[PDB]
Symmetry: C5
Subunit: 306 residues, 5 copies
């Protein structure tokens, strides 16, 4: 039943890799908790540098290493400190830089209120409870609004929850339940580059594609149909090479499927001209009647699939 | 004849690189096995942190480091624990994140029930037997069905086998045989992006390729033949740059070979028009007869090579 | 109230990654500060190599590890030295190579007087003051003026400021205020490659785009309109693949938006020819009148958006 | 004159990077050699884990660290073992995973019987001789014949040689000569992907290039000459981006030089039509005579340059 | 005034990254210098392995760690040795593999006699002089002349210089001057791949560009002008993606600027045909007179800008 009061500084959130669904965060954890009141030599409380901590594990000072569940690997314990007060209160801060991983659903790929969920747990302590959470983001992030991608943010929002394992330990009564700190932080991507040159060639190259139907010769309309087939695969060739790649297609490239299938259906009208089953290749009066539903029958698909 | 009961937690499977044929997995191994009953100071059993383990190797506590055969290198022993009971039972868990490597046959490249075969062995112990296997996957993976690529899974399926080396040791009788834990786990890739924009331009650009035969001029049909030659190499140019690369061609690009060879054979009909050995370039009535086998003679190849 | 006099050597600034907004710097920090006058054996002052420092932390020599706030992770303490004078003055130099990160606004992307802001702080010392700053850049960097990108520089410019935390410590009176060294260094990119082949095809492919309006046939003007649509996306395909990528569009690619929208508006004039609501496709005398505002109405946009 | 008997296990050969000319190999080295007969406590011989070896260097057990000359850096000593027999025989195995580098000539780039030459040396021992070599490859590699690139192999083939340095030491008589183990292992690449879609578009795009000469108009033949110039640089654009890159051109791209130079020479015939120094652009009867040497004069170059 | 005789082995020079201006080198440093004559137990001189050196720093053996100024970071001290003679002579060799960085001017980008300048310094020793330099390159590098890029070399050329710092120390008289070993080694790149397919499409695509002027129709000449604009940006798209990238344009791509500007000036002649201010689009007799200066006025630019 040992109390722990935590505090989180957040310096930097960066580097989102979505094939792993990972990101990287930087800041300081701070643990303040009362242990046993010892004497501090001199008057000022004792301080201890990086390697010197490994002198004070030898006499068994109860310093709990606090894991991460979202992490992959082990974060670099860069610098450390023990503000050992003579009243038993211990302050322990640490710079951390780990590769964190949590679920990031892409419901709408440019505009996404996403939620980086940092956490903390005690790795080998059942009911040595984490009493007081504190999120202490203090860096001025919103001010470079056009600059920072994700950091056009809302509000810091901590939480303390509880979780219980049963298969893990042998003692099932009331000492197999871990106190879990779950510090979620929301973030919105700056969608400027993700909207300016992303779907702007997409949504109107189909609005360039309806000029093949206003042609009368199958020497000028076939090479433009081949040009329509070339430019869409050149476009799909432009897509993934910039972006962090995905095992499920983005909302942008839900319409390269249509940039196929519409021209795929336009081949049916071109061959309805070619295999016009009374005369030649010349467009019939039914082909002069689909002249309006060919531009306007495919730009009305963008408003239903969002 | 020392018993060992193991348990595996599985947190994350990710990052498949197939030029190495490797992947990365995260979780906790847990060893529970009875050694010698000592005294635990106080009433609660003894616990030991990360660096403090290296105090307890000095008095020779029998802590077996458990290797991996599928690994390349050495996995990061991030955090550790010794739940030393006074009855002699030892619990030792560890977070692991190693680059594992095992054979992954690509029989069908989008749809593949693949099998990640984690294992464990004792590195330097002959007949100190691993008695009780336990796979304990507990993370909710299926729920984000569209999101997780591989994790649309089946069932956890452990196994304990036996393997024997003979060239390795000098003692051949009954102490050169290792107990091998072989925890296989199946996984199915989410084939959405791998099917939506992968072969959809492939299987019908040939269905765009048969419009060159419905032409009468060798000024409009030659530039479209060159367009057919350009677009297939632009397509092959689109392929590998997204995908993890392969020393053996995927089932998708078994048909860029045909996207050559069909147009390669179409040059024979174009030159049968050009070198029509009685008159000029004009299509003969045999060329007006292959007008049906030219679309429909190559879309029937997709159903035999699977 | 312990005085510290610092000195910074700067050997190399390189490797700007702007998705992190990071760079890498190399040089030597030097701390000169008087502690306590001890005896030096022999006559010459004591020197101490790399690992030997960890003999002299055991007797508690007050060696302050000096952090970095711009860093991400921990820089490699390659080599070290303690010029321990018998009068108490300590000289401590160290080679450093860390990934530093600070805000780099891209107001104008080729021409940018940017400001790499190295810093230093005491990690766990409140009022042990850093008295004397000194920047000592000494490498000849300007001499290879065409060669070095950023190093066409101005002047070294140190500073000593002060910063105070209040939430951090428990003692609020006058011992929660850190002395902060903030050594800013300016740098100008060598814009040769960034100007020679960057916007030179950009600003006049629109000056190639006005030849579609001097055409009379909709068999030659439609395929050139499709060529204009192809070349702009091939250009945008050329852009990002060389450059370090950005979440906000560069000043170069503010005009691929116009390379869309101008040709997008040119489709309105082409369809004003096509849907000329008295006769056919032939250009009216209003279309023969926009022959001058079509070249010269879009090259005058480059002078307002800078 | 201390005898050493070595043994090599080979688990995996992978990851060939040819700009370094490096690869990566995995397996176990095993040293068996008799030192001094000590006592083993109990009856079973002594075993020693990873960190525990550093207790047994303190009493000066003669454990020779065995270097590698092909390596770049230092391989990861993952796990270790000392099977210390009471008769003085020492068995020491180690998992190794190093970046090895040796000369790999590319005489023929798809089909290459290459030779990975692992080695071993004593780093600081002159005439403490390595008596008995043993290569012990035991993994079933050939069975996945289509799958494994290099591992379609021949036979393991060890060797023990001798090498002498003279500039190295000061004692020149008979104690400056190192025993060198040179375990070469051959390997053949699986050339399936390297032949299926590598030169198949190469060797017959020239067989598409001879249709420009069967044209009569310089409005249809010039744009196809420009198409021939476009497609060859689009092809060269396809090449290097998949492949591991080279400072000397592969045998595949010895013919993009000809894919230039042949069309380069075809410009001479096109301008012989254009600058026909009696009349116009119309093809003379000499241009109607080179109609056969233009296809068949360049497909006969593939059989001489191999 | 302590003498040091050095010796350098050079095994491998590889991996030139020019955005850092770095490379990687492998070999052995050897220090031979007389200290104090001690006793060697037995008759043979004492040898000391890797970790065992850290027993002999404890009794304060004067082993100088020798830095590098061209390095970025810290090179991996892989293996080590102390040939401690009883006469006081110490031999210390070490394998090194560091990322070295020195200025590499690109005066001519394919053909460049470049100069890798390795160095050495004493990190914390003023006048403990490095007396005898020795470069001892011994690997057979020239023999694979087509294979090795840089290693078509000249001659090893050592040097010993002197350098003095004044701001560094407090003692200015004669003990603030470091002995600097500066072992420069020249190297010439194998220019085969850098010349075969690098500028060969460059220098004559302009020699393909003068066929637009021999056209009479503005329906065939405008689409070829657009083809000339497309192919040059497709070429520039081919360039950087293979090559190590540069903040200053290579000598190859000094002429894509001209591949713009010449066709840019050709638009002036095309519009001189179009805006021929007496009649129509038809080429005047002045346009029939620039038919010779249009091919031959731009191939004479390659011989002045080198």
């Amino acid at each position: 039943p040992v109390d722990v009061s935590v505090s989180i500084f957040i310096n930097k959130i960066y580097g989102v890799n979505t094939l792993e669904q990972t990101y990287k965060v930087d800041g300081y954890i701070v643990a303040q908790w009362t242990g046993k009141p010892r004497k501090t030599p001199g008057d000022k409380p004792l301080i201890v540098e990086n390697t010197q901590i490994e002198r004070w594990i030898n006499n068994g000072l109860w310093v709990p290493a606090l894991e991460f569940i979202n992490v992959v690997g082990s974060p670099d314990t860069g610098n450390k400190r023990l503000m050992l007060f003579p009243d038993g209160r211990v302050i322990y801060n640490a710079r951390f830089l780990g590769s964190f991983s949590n679920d990031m659903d892409f419901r709408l790929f440019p505009f996404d209120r996403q939620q980086f969920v940092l956490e903390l747990e005690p790795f080998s302590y059942n009911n040595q409870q984490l009493r007081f959470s504190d999120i202490q983001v203090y860096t001025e992030n919103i001010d470079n609004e056009e600059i920072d991608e994700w950091w056009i943010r809302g509000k810091a929002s901590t939480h303390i929850s509880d979780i219980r394992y049963d298969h893990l330990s042998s003692v099932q009564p009331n000492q197999n339940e871990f106190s879990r700190i779950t510090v979620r932080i929301d973030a919105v991507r700056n969608p400027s580059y993700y909207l300016w040159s992303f779907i702007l060639p997409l949504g109107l190259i189909i609005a360039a594609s309806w000029s093949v139907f206003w042609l009368e010769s199958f020497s000028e309309r076939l090479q433009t149909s081949f040009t329509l087939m070339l430019t869409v695969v050149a476009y799909a060739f432009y897509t993934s090479n910039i972006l962090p790649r995905l095992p499920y297609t983005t909302v942008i490239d839900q319409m390269i499927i249509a940039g196929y299938g519409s021209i795929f259906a336009a081949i049916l009208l071109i061959i309805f001209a070619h295999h016009r089953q009374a005369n030649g290749v010349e467009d019939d009066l039914l082909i002069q009647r689909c002249r309006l539903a060919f531009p306007l029958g495919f730009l009305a698909i963008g408003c239903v699939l969002v």
